[PDB]
Amino acid sequence: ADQKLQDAKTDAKQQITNFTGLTEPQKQALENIINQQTSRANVAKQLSHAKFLNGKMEELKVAVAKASLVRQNSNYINEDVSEKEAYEQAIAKGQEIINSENNPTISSTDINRTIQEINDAEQNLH
């Protein structure tokens, strides 16, 4: 019923508000997506997507936040400039996503690609 759909949207938006991986712009974009759904099945699909995106954003935030530890404890200080530049480029791309205010991507594949670029570059420093 209409009351069932309204309640499912409210629940989903409340869950999204609790997430810590997603940025506030990402939460707002997803809450808007939730509000536009016409069935509870579709609300659940979008909430499942938000939960997965939240996990990837958690992974991305860790990969970016650990950069100073990596610079200090890996071979970064001794490494060739190409490897150091690749790492800083990848970290900067991750920072761009996290700090974005204008319509941040809600594409988990885009996030996963950025995570993988950081992880690949970090691996070459160990």
Author numbering: 1 to 126
Authors' description from the paper:
Extracellular matrix binding protein (Embp) and its subdomains referred to as the F-repeat and the FG-repeat are critical for adherence of S. epidermidis to surface-immobilized Fn. Embp is a giant 1-MDa surface protein consisting of 10,203 amino acids (aa).
The C-terminal repetitive region (aa 4511 to 9509), also present in S. aureus homolog Ebh, is composed by a row of 40 repeats consisting of 125 aa. Similar to the F-repeat, the FG-repeat reveals an elongated shape approximately 70 Å in length and 20 Å in width and height. A- and S-modules are connected by a shared helix α3, lancing through both three-helix bundles (the length of the central helix α3 is about 40 Å). The FG-repeat is characterized by a remarkable strong dipole character. Although the overall amino acid sequence identity with Embp is only 30%, the structural data for the FG-repeat at 1.55-Å resolution reveals high structural homology to EbhA and strict conservation of all major structural key elements.
